[PDB]
Amino acid sequence: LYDAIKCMKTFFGWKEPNIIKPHEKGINPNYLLTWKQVLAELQDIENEEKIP
Amino acid sequence: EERFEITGTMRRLADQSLPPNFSSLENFRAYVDGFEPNGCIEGKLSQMSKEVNARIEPFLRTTPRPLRLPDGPPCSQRSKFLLMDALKLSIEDPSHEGEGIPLYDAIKCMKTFFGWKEPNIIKPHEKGINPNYLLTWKQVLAELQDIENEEKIPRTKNMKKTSQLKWALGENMAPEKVDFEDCKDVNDLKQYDSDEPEPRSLACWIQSEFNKACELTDSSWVELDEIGEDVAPIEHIASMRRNYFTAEVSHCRATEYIMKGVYINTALLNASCAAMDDFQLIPMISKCRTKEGRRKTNLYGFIIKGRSHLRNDTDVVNFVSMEFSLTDPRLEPHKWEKYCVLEIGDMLLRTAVGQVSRPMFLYVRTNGTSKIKMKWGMEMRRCLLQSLQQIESMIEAESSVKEKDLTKEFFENKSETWPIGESPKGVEEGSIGKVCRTLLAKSVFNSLYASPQLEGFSAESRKLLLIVQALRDNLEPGTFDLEGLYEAIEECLINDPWVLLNASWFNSFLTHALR
Amino acid sequence: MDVNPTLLFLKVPVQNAISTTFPYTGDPPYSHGTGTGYTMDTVNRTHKYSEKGKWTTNTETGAPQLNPIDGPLPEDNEPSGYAQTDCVLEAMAFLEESHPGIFENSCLETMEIVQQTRVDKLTQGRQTYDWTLNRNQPAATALANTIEVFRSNGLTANESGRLIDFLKDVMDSMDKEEMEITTHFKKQRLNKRSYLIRALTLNTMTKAIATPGMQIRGFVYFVEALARSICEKLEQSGLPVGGNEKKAKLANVVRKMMTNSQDTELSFTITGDNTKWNENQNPRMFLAMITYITRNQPEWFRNVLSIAPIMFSNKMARLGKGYMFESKSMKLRTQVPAEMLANIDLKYFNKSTREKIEKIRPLLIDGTASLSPGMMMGMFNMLSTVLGVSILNLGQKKYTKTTYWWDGLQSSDDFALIVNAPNHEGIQAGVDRFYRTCKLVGINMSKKKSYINRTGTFEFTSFFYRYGFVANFSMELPSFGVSGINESADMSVGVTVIKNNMINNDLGPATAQMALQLFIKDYRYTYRCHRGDTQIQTRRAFELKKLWEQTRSKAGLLVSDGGPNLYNIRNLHIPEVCLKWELMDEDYQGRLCNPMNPFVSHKEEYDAVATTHSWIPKRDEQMYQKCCNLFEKFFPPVGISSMVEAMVSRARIDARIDFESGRIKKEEFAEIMKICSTIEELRRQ
Amino acid sequence: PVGISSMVEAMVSRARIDARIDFESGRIKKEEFAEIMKICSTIEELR
Amino acid sequence: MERIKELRDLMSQSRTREILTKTTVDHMAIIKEKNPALRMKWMMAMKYPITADKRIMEMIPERNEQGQTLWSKTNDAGSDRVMVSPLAVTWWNRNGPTTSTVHYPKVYKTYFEKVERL
Ligand SMILES: [Mg+2]
């Protein structure tokens, strides 16, 4: 988990994410929300009193 | 029309607040109003005794004796943390830059050492329960492994309030406040005996400690921020002075001590106000860039904090201080009066001339501090400014006589020309660089061993120095009560190892200064 | 090689590296020496120097009072309080002769002041003794309390505004037999005698030896105000002139005594320091000075100025809080106050403390020690300087009437004296004549502290003169760190603090550059606002780098927006926003200063532009109250003990007292002791 | 629930806490609070 | 009997347990930092130390591109102000609205005149 967060913190080039080539047979807005949720929940660990 | 009146209670005080013979402010007022001078001074001069004089004992190359330093058992180390004896477990932490978490930085350091022995006591604290100091160290090692049991990892650790910790941190050793309405008559009740602090003799270690403070290291201990591009002539001269000095002080041990000062006192104050009534474990951390230049974290040991319900700046926080060292405490035991030292493991150094196993010790002691004394340690970087200003002020002064700035000559002069030390032969000289580090060490020790005894000895000795300077200037110097000055200087020399070395340093100068 | 910094002085002269003899440069963490034992030594030594003088009993106070002045001339070199009225006035007469109009003119200036001066002024100052609540307090709070009593008692003249009217109330307060204060909690009642003690009190603190009451302080101002206008008109006075303006005065007095001086004439400077300055010179002497200055002047002006010396000649010194005791076995400690130090036994104390109490007890009246002679430190600094200068003044060729003459510089107790004469014996004579003329007005040069050398080097107020140069170094460096207001302010403050220390405190440039570096370092760490190009990780790292990339002219960015530090010696007076104003991108500046922003507070001595950085920081309930309510079921305890082990300890006590008297059975006593051991096994782990 | 405590005395301890919090806020009556405290003492007498 | 059985119940809940072993008898009256320099350093450590008007929530987004929370719907003292991270101030200074800043050299003329002499 931390090996990942440490890697993530080496990149300071994140754009406002937009869809470039969608899944024809799928709900594309859900794929965007999931990525935003990852980014979100990763920062929420640095909110927790004790780190999981 | 402004109108101010002296009557009643005030007039009776006015009439009683005069010279003797005068019984009335208005009577006196009239004496002064119509006073005219009649050689009253010139008269009372001739009336006065000739034994009342300011006869000038002339100060000759022969008149000044060496200061008398007190006799007694050898002086003890009273610094918060170890200085030259200190030992550190280091990790290289490159990818993660900037403020991290100290607790984990420590655990990461701890895991670089796999040489922990069954800890046994090597030199005990005469005035202490030594088995408690051993149990506390075992408890640290124990509670550190217990974090790797917890489902969620904690930001800081709070030690379990055991007997040995409750003891060491002085829990329930504060005596009870008794209204004098209740304890009116008690037949063994004597005042807070401010005892004559038993005199101590100057031991060698204090000089050793300072010698090691003036040395360079393989580690930049200070990384100072950018500054506006230089424009005005002063700005170009300024930056030259600063950079030259900043260069020679960069890697000086004294600057490691400054960082040890800041980090520890910072971390101790943050804990003292955050976890007030918890026994928080507080890792003793510093950071440096290596001689090749990678960010390196250092763990010197641990401090466990007591209860810190701090109301005033004088209010006390008791703490235990477990510090790693390679130095055997049986070599200079007189130093480690206040410490109970354990032997807690073996280090291995496979050097060019073979394998060298050395034992690792743990200088544990009870201790305390206040917001004021913590702040003091947090602001220890001022030692850099104090050190630079001395260097800057000398150059400014030595340049005045010639009228041209000597900044470049001083620093570029690759000949060792400044008398800064002594050896069996006599006074040995050094580089301007050695002077910078020496003056820094002085400012740092002046902070670390800060005492009123120092304040006094600094102030009174200054006079004797300036007198001696006048003797060297052939300015026919004279004193009024030279024996009185010495008594005032020597009155400050009791037991403080730092003030005692400074007095040894004086006697050392005074011999060479008269030749 | 053993490193010894003092061996520098073999190469460098002591005046050049005098900077290295000042150990701290900043306030150290102790400043010890203001105990109750320390106050009683001042009271004793003050009387001991003045001990042959006339003892009186005060009519109003009922206090033993010593008057050493017009007393017996000294026959030893120990400190004498025995001043001589005829001598003081003569010194003050010959001053007004040597500086014609000085007093008359300086009175006219001060008559302008005394009217215009406002009560507001009195709030500025250190610790004060608040007689309202019998404590030390802040200055502004001590006045609010005092006017609240003066409001309650018929003394409403203070509410006119001017200070002279507040005094008029302080005067009328002494005559009143009752003194009542509504202390919101209780009407509080003081008889005329007990009030008077507190109005004339000096009280010791833990922040000077002792601070004075609010009644006495008012007058002390107007006196020092007069003493200022005098000092201002005297060349020799080293007060109250500025930093570099003073270094001049050192150069002047040497240049005066060294250009006249021919081949034959010797010149010696004595590095002066007067011993026990405050304990010797007597309030009655200051009254004698003031009344001679204010001759041919209106009575109202004469009076207000006379009041301060009068109070100081009748004053009482309270002995702090008291002595702290300690029982070894019993494990007690108890604080006996000052009030009940008179009505207390002498056999409990040690050998050093007994004698100190046995000497002062004759002076002890209502828990305060009577102190008619001497003063408390730094009170009449400027007036005491006039007296000092008046003795320097008597060193002119005319007043000496001899081949020796003298001049120099004086500021309170510190002085510097240059004596010229055709031969050595002449110098020795000139010195003695100064030393003895000084004794006649209660000025005792310290033989210990003082020394003498050929003119060319000396010290005065820690300015170390050496052949025309005085060494340049700041003796008190301020907190270089963050101020804790917000990003916007702290920058301005921090940069201002350095500039001010350069202009006032004589701080060198190279040191100021490093001072600036250490501030910026602290600033960026505190506010997580490390430069945009750096790799350091914080929460802000991302935002600041995104802004750094966006921004064209980066020298525009403020340090709090990851910009570069553009400050240096020259800039330090400019606010950062102004400094970088031209270099800012149009849109950046557009946002930085847009006052529709949600951060600034109300849409609108440090100088700061209002930006988004001008922000304002911030200042279960059932489960905390549930534990506190169960504690009430145990106590409808021991202070240091925790909640659970003061609950489990009360349970076993009620368990074994209800088992004896027979309230609970053997079954209900065994159940409590069982449960009391289940709670203790949850605590340990 | 506390780590060292067994299953039954971390179950019987949670019951009395919810019993006295639902009695204050007024969720269960005096009859349904007395019934929980009675059953909570039948479980403790089996231990 | 009932009060000592109740103390065992509260020591089985590990949150009520850590209010009984920490808190002292002296420091129960406080349940019922003069130096601002630390107080600031202390607060800057927190997620949301800065206060602002509720309109911020309409003006700047809750999270940035990297998913960092810029403000929180928290209780402030006397009114409907909310708590904000120093990220938000930087966010505003890089994505905020641009008004015309011609009047600031003229409003702060007293300050700006120190630059004209240099
Ligand atoms: Mg002097």
Side-chain angles (χ1 to χ4, degrees):
Chain A
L1 167 60
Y2 302 134
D3 268 12
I5 294 171
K6 281 177 192 184
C7 287
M8 287 292 278
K9 284 173 164 175
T10 74
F11 189 56
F12 292 132
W14 310 106
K15 269 198 295 201
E16 187 49 39
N18 78 101
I19 304 158
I20 209 74
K21 124 63 215 198
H23 183 202
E24 45 262 322
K25 302 180 171 178
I27 302 166
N28 294 283
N30 286 342
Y31 292 132
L32 195 86
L33 286 168
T34 35
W35 171 240
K36 288 194 161 200
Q37 192 183 339
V38 164
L39 289 168
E41 292 226 43
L42 280 188
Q43 256 77 172
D44 282 342
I45 72 100
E46 292 137 44
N47 187 33
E48 297 184 39
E49 253 213 338
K50 296 183 176 178
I51 67 167
Chain B
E1 280 287 321
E2 251 64 34
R3 162 212 170 194
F4 199 85
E5 17 63 81
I6 322 172
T7 55
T9 321
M10 286 305 302
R11 199 88 198 189
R12 286 191 286 283
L13 294 165
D15 289 331
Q16 279 186 109
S17 57
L18 305 174
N21 301 15
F22 297 82
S23 194
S24 183
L25 177 68
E26 253 274 59
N27 284 354
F28 179 64
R29 219 91 103 164
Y31 170 56
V32 173
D33 272 74
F35 179 96
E36 215 67 69
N38 185 51
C40 312
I41 290 167
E42 289 108 58
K44 293 221 162 154
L45 260 165
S46 74
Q47 287 194 199
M48 191 186 286
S49 179
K50 298 299 190 172
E51 209 212 332
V52 177
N53 56 75
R55 213 203 81 265
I56 298 168
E57 45 168 331
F59 190 88
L60 300 201
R61 206 164 223 86
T62 56
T63 46
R65 65 164 171 81
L67 297 168
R68 279 183 293 93
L69 308 179
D71 269 328
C75 52
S76 81
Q77 178 70 283
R78 48 162 275 230
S79 68
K80 294 298 189 206
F81 47 81
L82 293 187
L83 294 172
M84 79 186 182
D85 313 278
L87 175 67
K88 36 190 144 163
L89 307 179
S90 300
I91 61 166
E92 171 192 344
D93 198 8
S95 70
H96 170 52
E97 195 60 36
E99 195 208 327
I101 292 166
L103 168 62
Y104 303 134
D105 268 13
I107 294 171
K108 282 211 74 198
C109 287
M110 286 292 278
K111 284 199 189 181
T112 74
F113 188 56
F114 290 133
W116 312 105
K117 185 204 299 289
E118 186 49 40
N120 78 101
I121 303 158
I122 280 290
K123 125 62 216 198
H125 184 202
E126 290 174 322
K127 301 180 70 181
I129 303 166
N130 294 283
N132 285 342
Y133 293 131
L134 196 91
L135 286 167
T136 35
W137 171 240
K138 288 188 170 194
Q139 191 182 340
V140 165
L141 288 168
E143 292 226 44
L144 281 190
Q145 255 74 178
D146 283 343
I147 72 100
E148 294 133 35
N149 261 14
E150 298 182 34
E151 190 194 340
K152 295 165 174 274
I153 314 161
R155 260 51 139 76
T156 63
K157 193 66 200 200
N158 294 336
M159 300 306 284
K160 292 176 167 189
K161 294 207 188 72
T162 65
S163 63
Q164 61 268 24
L165 265 187
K166 278 184 202 290
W167 173 72
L169 298 164
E171 180 153 299
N172 295 209
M173 283 199 75
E176 73 186 349
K177 300 165 176 186
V178 278
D179 206 41
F180 226 110
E181 301 293 348
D182 295 60
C183 90
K184 210 177 69 181
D185 306 327
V186 192
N187 300 46
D188 61 337
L189 181 69
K190 38 269 185 180
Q191 66 188 123
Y192 175 71
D193 291 352
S194 293
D195 293 350
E196 183 173 310
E198 286 172 17
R200 291 274 202 282
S201 65
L202 176 66
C204 271
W205 61 267
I206 191 64
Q207 168 84 52
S208 316
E209 278 285 13
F210 184 83
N211 286 336
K212 288 283 185 259
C214 301
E215 286 181 332
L216 289 158
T217 66
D218 312 54
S219 276
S220 168
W221 286 106
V222 166
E223 183 182 5
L224 289 169
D225 278 60
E226 353 106 300
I227 196 188
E229 188 168 42
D230 300 319
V231 161
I234 195 73
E235 293 182 331
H236 282 273
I237 301 160
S239 301
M240 188 171 290
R241 287 174 184 173
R242 172 166 50 79
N243 287 303
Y244 270 137
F245 168 88
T246 306
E248 249 97 35
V249 147
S250 182
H251 297 79
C252 181
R253 189 98 62 200
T255 54
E256 183 189 352
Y257 298 168
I258 290 173
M259 251 211 180
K260 265 172 75 102
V262 166
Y263 271 94
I264 293 170
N265 282 288
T266 290
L268 225 173
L269 186 44
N270 278 314
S272 290
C273 295
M276 291 210 138
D277 55 10
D278 311 1
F279 290 6
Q280 179 158 128
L281 183 62
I282 306 172
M284 298 199 290
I285 307 296
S286 74
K287 298 182 181 196
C288 55
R289 277 105 76 249
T290 38
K291 93 273 163 184
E292 74 272 351
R294 288 120 123 193
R295 254 302 188 200
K296 206 186 75 166
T297 295
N298 318 293
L299 175 63
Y300 295 106
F302 301 86
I303 276 173
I304 301 166
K305 192 198 93 294
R307 279 181 197 174
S308 55
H309 297 300
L310 291 166
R311 319 222 68 184
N312 305 317
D313 266 39
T314 57
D315 277 20
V316 174
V317 183
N318 286 315
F319 70 101
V320 191
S321 69
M322 301 150 278
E323 339 196 34
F324 316 130
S325 163
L326 282 186
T327 78
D328 188 342
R330 287 165 294 199
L331 292 164
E332 293 183 305
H334 57 280
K335 194 167 171 185
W336 313 116
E337 179 188 305
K338 316 197 76 72
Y339 293 83
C340 160
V341 194
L342 322 181
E343 177 172 334
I344 61 159
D346 298 55
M347 302 245 295
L348 201 62
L349 309 161
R350 286 162 184 163
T351 69
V353 287
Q355 186 184 202
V356 190
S357 188
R358 200 161 179 167
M360 180 199 291
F361 304 78
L362 190 78
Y363 289 69
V364 192
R365 71 164 282 182
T366 306
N367 210 334
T369 199
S370 53
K371 286 180 180 147
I372 188 69
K373 294 185 174 200
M374 285 191 267
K375 281 180 198 161
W376 180 249
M378 283 184 63
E379 282 267 304
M380 266 189 79
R381 273 143 162 168
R382 63 152 198 76
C383 292
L384 289 170
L385 297 181
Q386 200 197 341
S387 208
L388 178 46
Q389 185 167 232
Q390 283 156 22
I391 290 297
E392 187 175 25
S393 177
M394 279 170 45
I395 289 159
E396 212 89 61
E398 291 280 25
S399 299
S400 273
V401 172
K402 297 174 180 181
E403 297 220 44
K404 115 148 216 283
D405 172 82
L406 295 178
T407 295
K408 188 169 180 192
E409 271 162 297
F410 273 28
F411 281 101
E412 283 292 346
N413 187 335
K414 256 147 194 199
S415 229
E416 299 182 343
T417 52
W418 298 81
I420 199 67
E422 211 175 345
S423 82
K425 294 180 283 159
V427 176
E428 306 299 298
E429 30 265 309
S431 65
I432 184 62
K434 185 59 183 189
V435 178
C436 291
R437 287 186 291 280
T438 296
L439 282 186
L440 179 59
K442 196 169 184 292
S443 304
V444 168
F445 275 50
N446 279 340
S447 181
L448 287 168
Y449 293 114
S451 45
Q453 292 166 79
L454 178 62
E455 206 159 40
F457 172 84
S458 295
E460 296 304 321
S461 62
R462 196 176 306 152
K463 288 147 207 290
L464 187 58
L465 267 161
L466 282 151
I467 291 164
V468 169
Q469 185 54 49
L471 180 86
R472 287 157 55 80
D473 292 340
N474 309 316
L475 296 179
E476 295 179 327
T479 41
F480 293 116
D481 183 11
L482 180 53
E483 196 61 23
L485 171 54
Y486 270 83
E487 284 169 31
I489 293 166
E490 292 171 334
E491 181 157 322
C492 308
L493 308 176
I494 296 168
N495 53 16
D496 172 343
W498 178 233
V499 79
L500 286 186
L501 176 52
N502 279 261
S504 174
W505 281 340
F506 191 97
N507 294 328
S508 185
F509 157 81
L510 186 65
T511 53
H512 294 105
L514 311 176
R515 285 192 168 179
Chain C
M1 191 210 292
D2 273 8
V3 183
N4 170 343
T6 318
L7 293 177
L8 245 66
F9 297 124
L10 294 179
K11 166 163 190 148
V12 191
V14 160
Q15 287 88 346
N16 286 15
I18 200 72
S19 17
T20 72
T21 77
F22 285 69
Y24 298 130
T25 308
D27 202 322
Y30 47 82
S31 293
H32 298 323
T34 60
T36 291
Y38 290 76
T39 322
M40 287 201 304
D41 284 316
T42 309
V43 172
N44 286 340
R45 283 185 292 93
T46 300
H47 288 96
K48 177 177 181 167
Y49 307 136
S50 298
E51 79 192 335
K52 299 181 222 300
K54 189 175 76 186
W55 285 108
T56 312
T57 308
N58 201 312
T59 55
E60 315 307 283
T61 324
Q65 297 202 328
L66 232 180
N67 186 350
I69 83 102
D70 288 336
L73 297 193
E75 303 181 7
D76 60 336
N77 278 233
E78 293 298 313
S80 107
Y82 321 113
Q84 304 292 334
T85 306
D86 54 326
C87 289
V88 165
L89 296 169
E90 178 159 317
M92 295 297 285
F94 289 148
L95 192 70
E96 222 282 348
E97 192 181 13
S98 299
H99 302 87
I102 187 159
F103 296 149
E104 185 180 14
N105 293 122
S106 296
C107 281
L108 279 160
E109 292 184 356
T110 311
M111 278 193 295
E112 220 89 308
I113 295 287
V114 63
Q115 297 183 159
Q116 262 81 316
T117 312
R118 282 185 145 286
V119 173
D120 302 315
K121 196 88 193 200
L122 210 75
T123 54
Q124 296 149 14
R126 298 179 187 176
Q127 278 240 295
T128 305
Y129 172 67
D130 188 42
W131 69 270
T132 308
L133 306 176
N134 197 103
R135 255 232 204 83
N136 288 336
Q137 273 215 154
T141 60
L143 177 58
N145 271 297
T146 293
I147 294 166
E148 265 186 315
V149 193
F150 282 30
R151 194 171 202 181
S152 76
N153 306 312
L155 305 157
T156 62
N158 78 79
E159 296 160 32
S160 83
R162 60 214 301 260
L163 214 194
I164 185 169
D165 288 12
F166 171 65
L167 300 185
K168 279 162 167 299
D169 288 335
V170 169
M171 297 300 284
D172 297 7
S173 73
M174 301 287 192
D175 295 353
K176 288 185 173 201
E177 69 164 14
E178 295 187 58
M179 199 57 56
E180 174 98 303
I181 172 54
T182 49
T183 40
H184 299 285
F185 133 86
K186 166 164 186 164
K187 286 271 187 80
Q188 209 142 33
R189 203 258 157 181
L190 266 185
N191 69 112
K192 200 177 78 159
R193 202 165 323 281
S194 288
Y195 173 66
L196 195 68
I197 295 284
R198 295 188 185 189
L200 301 177
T201 291
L202 302 184
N203 201 10
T204 69
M205 68 305 257
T206 66
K207 297 181 192 175
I209 301 168
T211 51
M214 194 89 273
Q215 298 98 323
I216 190 165
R217 262 197 46 86
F219 306 101
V220 171
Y221 183 80
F222 291 128
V223 172
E224 284 291 75
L226 172 60
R228 201 190 201 82
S229 48
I230 315 308
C231 287
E232 281 180 0
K233 291 200 70 175
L234 289 162
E235 199 279 333
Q236 293 135 323
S237 169
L239 301 174
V241 294
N244 268 294
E245 198 210 325
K246 182 169 201 172
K247 274 168 187 151
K249 286 199 169 155
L250 292 165
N252 270 70
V253 296
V254 177
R255 192 174 46 74
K256 186 188 296 176
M257 308 289 290
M258 283 298 309
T259 51
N260 297 343
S261 173
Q262 70 157 224
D263 294 17
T264 196
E265 203 185 50
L266 305 197
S267 187
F268 283 75
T269 316
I270 133 174
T271 300
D273 268 312
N274 288 139
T275 212
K276 266 92 179 188
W277 177 260
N278 297 122
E279 280 94 67
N280 287 310
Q281 66 193 165
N282 181 295
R284 300 153 196 283
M285 268 330 174
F286 288 127
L287 176 57
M289 270 187 264
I290 287 173
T291 50
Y292 185 97
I293 294 162
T294 60
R295 65 202 167 97
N296 302 317
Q297 296 294 337
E299 287 211 53
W300 70 274
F301 182 57
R302 226 198 219 282
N303 289 357
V304 290
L305 286 165
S306 299
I307 303 301
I310 292 162
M311 292 214 193
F312 265 95
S313 208
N314 295 276
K315 69 193 178 286
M316 318 291 286
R318 185 170 290 155
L319 311 185
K321 288 200 170 163
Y323 272 83
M324 175 171 56
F325 286 68
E326 204 188 66
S327 206
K328 298 292 91 67
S329 57
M330 291 278 284
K331 203 82 171 64
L332 305 176
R333 66 157 182 172
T334 189
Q335 174 186 214
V336 300
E339 259 53 26
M340 285 72 163
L341 221 166
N343 304 125
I344 218 80
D345 205 323
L346 301 106
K347 71 185 176 66
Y348 287 117
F349 295 91
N350 70 78
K351 188 260 189 299
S352 182
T353 309
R354 178 168 294 97
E355 291 188 52
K356 287 185 208 178
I357 297 165
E358 279 178 355
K359 283 175 205 161
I360 197 171
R361 265 194 181 198
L363 296 153
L364 195 57
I365 300 294
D366 202 21
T368 53
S370 191
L371 197 77
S372 175
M375 295 214 145
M376 258 47 176
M377 190 167 75
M379 201 83 231
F380 288 63
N381 285 318
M382 304 220 66
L383 187 57
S384 80
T385 303
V386 173
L387 182 62
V389 167
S390 68
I391 306 305
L392 275 87
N393 178 60
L394 273 32
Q396 283 165 278
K397 277 133 135 58
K398 73 175 292 191
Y399 290 124
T400 58
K401 312 172 208 289
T402 25
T403 47
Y404 68 67
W405 69 299
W406 73 67
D407 203 352
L409 303 166
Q410 185 88 58
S411 62
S412 297
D413 40 295
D414 211 320
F415 81 91
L417 179 70
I418 299 163
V419 188
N420 289 16
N423 61 316
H424 253 112
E425 190 165 36
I427 294 289
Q428 178 57 72
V431 166
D432 288 321
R433 208 269 177 75
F434 176 85
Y435 173 65
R436 294 168 82 239
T437 305
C438 275
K439 286 287 180 176
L440 291 176
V441 302
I443 288 171
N444 317 250
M445 175 206 293
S446 198
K447 295 202 163 187
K448 301 177 79 179
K449 300 166 211 274
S450 303
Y451 58 101
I452 188 174
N453 56 279
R454 278 198 168 285
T455 301
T457 80
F458 66 100
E459 170 275 340
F460 173 66
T461 72
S462 306
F463 289 177
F464 297 86
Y465 184 97
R466 183 182 179 77
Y467 299 117
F469 183 71
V470 171
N472 251 291
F473 71 103
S474 179
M475 273 173 284
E476 217 254 320
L477 306 153
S479 182
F480 56 83
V482 135
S483 335
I485 303 158
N486 55 15
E487 289 175 325
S488 176
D490 288 3
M491 176 59 67
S492 208
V493 178
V495 176
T496 300
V497 168
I498 297 165
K499 173 205 68 213
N500 289 342
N501 255 258
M502 289 191 76
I503 63 186
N504 293 354
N505 226 316
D506 282 304
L507 171 64
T511 313
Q513 291 196 312
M514 184 161 286
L516 169 60
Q517 283 184 285
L518 288 166
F519 170 67
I520 295 291
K521 192 175 189 182
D522 203 75
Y523 183 91
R524 279 173 160 152
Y525 169 82
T526 286
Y527 292 116
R528 313 269 180 285
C529 62
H530 301 283
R531 186 151 86 166
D533 59 33
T534 62
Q535 303 96 315
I536 285 52
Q537 292 173 10
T538 75
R539 299 183 227 73
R540 287 190 89 154
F542 176 63
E543 290 283 350
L544 268 71
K545 210 159 167 64
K546 272 280 147 275
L547 169 54
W548 179 272
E549 202 59 32
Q550 161 187 318
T551 302
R552 182 197 297 92
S553 178
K554 320 210 184 206
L557 292 160
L558 299 175
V559 172
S560 59
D561 282 322
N565 168 48
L566 287 169
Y567 276 115
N568 199 334
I569 305 311
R570 70 192 190 271
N571 296 320
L572 301 188
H573 59 253
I574 301 166
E576 199 200 6
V577 189
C578 302
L579 176 58
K580 300 194 192 186
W581 189 260
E582 295 300 338
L583 303 104
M584 307 203 186
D585 288 23
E586 244 86 51
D587 50 350
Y588 170 55
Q589 196 183 250
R591 292 143 169 152
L592 179 58
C593 291
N594 185 339
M596 97 178 284
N597 81 67
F599 311 119
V600 187
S601 106
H602 100 259
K603 289 192 177 164
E604 44 205 41
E605 42 66 60
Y606 74 81
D607 280 311
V609 175
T611 69
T612 49
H613 298 305
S614 303
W615 45 253
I616 292 176
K618 182 181 190 168
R619 293 174 179 177
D620 272 0
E621 294 149 312
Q622 166 206 34
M623 252 67 191
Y624 270 111
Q625 192 91 132
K626 186 161 172 160
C627 286
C628 294
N629 301 328
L630 172 55
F631 202 102
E632 195 176 295
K633 292 189 175 183
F634 283 108
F635 302 94
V638 38
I640 63 182
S641 303
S642 68
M643 284 188 72
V644 67
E645 74 187 308
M647 280 171 157
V648 165
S649 189
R650 190 71 220 281
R652 282 166 168 159
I653 291 165
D654 265 301
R656 71 181 190 186
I657 291 167
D658 292 359
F659 179 85
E660 184 222 335
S661 69
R663 180 185 176 280
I664 51 162
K665 266 62 177 193
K666 198 91 134 79
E667 286 83 37
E668 288 152 325
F669 171 57
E671 197 201 334
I672 289 164
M673 292 290 317
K674 274 180 190 169
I675 295 164
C676 270
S677 62
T678 307
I679 299 160
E680 289 280 301
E681 200 136 26
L682 291 164
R683 289 167 59 262
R684 274 284 143 195
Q685 290 150 90
Chain D
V2 151
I4 291 182
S5 306
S6 66
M7 287 187 72
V8 67
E9 74 187 306
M11 279 171 160
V12 164
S13 188
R14 194 72 253 281
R16 283 167 169 165
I17 289 166
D18 266 304
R20 290 181 287 106
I21 291 168
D22 292 0
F23 181 85
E24 186 178 14
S25 70
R27 291 166 108 279
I28 51 164
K29 267 188 178 166
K30 188 85 164 186
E31 285 155 317
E32 285 182 31
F33 170 58
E35 196 171 342
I36 289 164
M37 293 286 285
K38 273 182 165 188
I39 296 163
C40 270
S41 62
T42 307
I43 299 159
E44 290 280 300
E45 274 214 328
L46 291 164
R47 297 164 59 262
Chain E
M1 214 298 293
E2 70 103 61
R3 72 186 180 168
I4 306 148
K5 210 172 197 185
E6 191 187 344
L7 181 52
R8 187 188 62 199
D9 288 324
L10 292 177
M11 292 281 289
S12 286
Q13 274 193 337
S14 40
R15 288 189 187 175
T16 44
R17 185 195 210 180
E18 283 191 32
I19 299 162
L20 284 163
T21 54
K22 290 184 204 285
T23 317
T24 58
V25 172
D26 226 328
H27 290 261
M28 284 197 304
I30 294 157
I31 297 171
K32 278 178 189 174
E33 237 171 342
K34 157 183 76 210
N35 182 240
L38 322 193
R39 201 195 187 178
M40 181 61 66
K41 280 201 170 61
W42 174 250
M43 275 184 282
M44 294 307 298
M46 301 173 185
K47 306 106 198 195
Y48 319 113
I50 296 170
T51 72
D53 188 87
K54 76 151 197 292
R55 74 173 176 270
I56 193 163
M57 294 186 286
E58 298 305 321
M59 247 133 266
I60 81 185
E62 199 164 344
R63 280 183 160 80
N64 67 13
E65 301 98 289
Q66 199 180 204
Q68 312 189 305
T69 315
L70 300 178
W71 51 259
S72 67
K73 296 183 200 76
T74 308
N75 212 47
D76 197 22
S79 83
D80 59 323
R81 296 189 87 88
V82 301
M83 294 307 158
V84 176
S85 189
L87 303 181
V89 169
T90 297
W91 191 99
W92 177 279
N93 296 354
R94 91 184 158 90
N95 303 138
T98 284
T99 41
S100 181
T101 331
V102 176
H103 76 284
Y104 267 80
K106 293 179 183 184
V107 166
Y108 293 104
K109 181 194 186 165
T110 179
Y111 301 81
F112 265 81
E113 275 214 341
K114 289 173 175 178
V115 181
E116 279 147 51
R117 294 182 191 81
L118 189 70

